[PDB]
């Protein structure tokens, strides 16, 4: 019965984590900021600095 | 962000600009008089109310736009008196009463002067302005050859990265004179001199790899 | 559609531009009564525009 | 009194700005390019559409900017897009879609109702194409005047011939001509022994206009 | 002491002009109709409301204008609407909706309280729509009398066909006319061999009038 | 655009009528005596400070509104002096000192709009009457071609101004015949055929770039 879908009677929350590990290197260090090489505009819309 | 002196004989700024409390701007308030001209000081911008007194508002905006007052002046007027206000009052910008808070922040940033420094590279005390092409140290001009500067800026712009002589030859000595690595050391020897030991900590050397730059604390 | 496509008689075209007609929608929307009142307007023009309305 | 130009692909002023109908200031519309500079004539105001596309409006104001002498250039955004509104667009005002009729009219009257400055010990006249230095007579023909003016206008900005061909020349570019060398030497000789150090050569990259002193 | 007749649908003279009650002039109101110009009796002046609508107010100022004899026509507009207020309204005096009582008094007491120029060898008589060129008889058609009139007062001024078209005709204005060519060719014929040098017709500059000698 | 003379017991256009300073019009100042009537010239309005002197102000109006002074004459007065302003003043219009910027704009377009020419410019001998589309140079008229007359003025009104033929292309041809701009050189001949050596130098040539207009001295 699709009521159960529209009601979400049987629906599940799915948390997940992506682990991002920036390490020490002879290249330097992987500075996680919004300093993106070659990035468009619509792709930064929901991103914080 | 801005220390703002409001010119109102009313005690509060919230009947004047209701959104103004919504920002962290520190709004000193002073009576709508000429004596408040002495109370300018280090006010970032002056807020002259001409919502009601357009004649004396014109007088006060002329007063804050005299021969030696660089503090930017805002006429805060009604909507039926915006057409009475133009560039004659010594102005660059004005604020309505229904100006929004993000609108207040935007127009206050625009009336103050954002204004980001050009290719002004900075590595510790050694700050480079490639524009004028000076790698000045603590304000004094520094004298490098054509190559040392471009050598230095590259490392300055890539401080910490462990470069190699073979690597550095390409981006400093271009695609030519492809042999003779030790040109680096002979040049490095001069670099480490004309830098001075006080900031040779910037210049790092690892055996068997070459040279680098290090950000100081 | 702007009336310019009608390619009616030059009098008809100008005699309709004079009173402010700029589109065929406004022209055919003007009822047939609305169209004979035009100061100094020939009937053959009205016939050609009527057949254009009905057919075009 | 004014004509307003909107660099917009909305093809209509009232969806862009509702108040512009209530003001009798008449508006022509052109698509969102810099090339629509050829579109404008005696229009005293030009606006850039930046309501739905923010960085496109920032780039079009960057291209439409303060070059000469300058025309009132405007750009319109929403409220949450007011953070990217800065001085680096090239503006004199900011407008919103929530801007009213008397508000738009008064800001337009503010921009239309400032003066170029050219001092280096060196009288510069942008319209006159006249030059003076340490004396009234400093004959500057067209190629060296804008040239020197660019240098004096960019005092200390190390310039290379490559950088001058697209600015001092058109250009093709008919570059690598060395004509800057004879041009600068004339600028060196004509300006006389004094003020000959302002236009100094920085090797391997060209020259820079040393400021006074 | 003045009867001021308001053509305004506000049903009260008060929001149209607030301070007029401070002066003991009488105000007689009616909606903004041309037929209420037949409602004028011993009215000394007349005010039209054009505060939000400049168009019908200007046209009503025009409706009054040129009728004669006439009673002077006044209008009230806004301050951002003073861009359209001009000499082309047929105004004798314009009022704002914030002008003071003694100000309205002074404007009224100023406004409510000769022959043609001779002669360019083309007299203008306004009765039969005809002129006189070195001779009593000069037949001018409905539009061949004002074409000479338009080039008469603007003697020496250059006017293009369209520039002439919208003032000489209504105009509509049609296109592909040569009506200027039909007229000026005709206006250069009924003027006799003499005074053929009264109109300047150089190629594609339009049709200017050249005054003697 | 329009020139105004301000007859006043004050020194600046700010205290007498401040909204002229709210305008981009050009207002000069003068004393409130009859000799300042010799200072009008080619102006378009003359505005007497009658805000204090009402008798002497109306006398200056009567000397200004005489037989042959075709510049439309004005006074500025207080609101308690408007009751003195009547038909016996002889004024054209009246302007309060409290009047707005656009208000004085519309009043000026009602009082102005002695038939001061719009596009009648005179560059020494080169008297370019664009109201008549004729340019007198040393008296005798210039019987240039239709598009030749345009080019001459575009060089004239840009006196001393050097441009490439492409820029000249936009001001003579516009959006047409982009390539093969040589005919401008031939059109320079069509200019010099009707100029002659008396002013054949007034159009300076610029080898490899274009030409220029020379200001006579």
Swiss-Prot record, chain A:
Disulfide bonds: none annotated. It comes from the Bacteria. The RNAP catalytic core consists of 2 alpha, 1 beta, 1 beta' and 1 omega subunit. When a sigma factor is associated with the core the holoenzyme is formed, which can initiate transcription. Interacts with CarD, TRCF (Mfd) and RbpA. Belongs to the RNA polymerase beta chain family. DNA-dependent RNA polymerase catalyzes the transcription of DNA into RNA using the four ribonucleoside triphosphates as substrates. This is DNA-directed RNA polymerase subunit beta. It comes from Mycobacterium tuberculosis (strain ATCC 25618 / H37Rv). The chain holds residues 738 to 786 of 1178 of the full protein.
From Swiss-Prot, chain C:
Induction: 3-fold repressed by starvation. Signal peptide: none annotated. The N-terminal domain is essential for RNAP assembly and basal transcription, whereas the C-terminal domain is involved in interaction with transcriptional regulators and with upstream promoter elements. DNA-dependent RNA polymerase catalyzes the transcription of DNA into RNA using the four ribonucleoside triphosphates as substrates. Homodimer. The RNAP catalytic core consists of 2 alpha, 1 beta, 1 beta' and 1 omega subunit. When a sigma factor is associated with the core the holoenzyme is formed, which can initiate transcription. Belongs to the RNA polymerase alpha chain family. This is DNA-directed RNA polymerase subunit alpha. The chain holds residues 249 to 304 of 347 of the full protein.
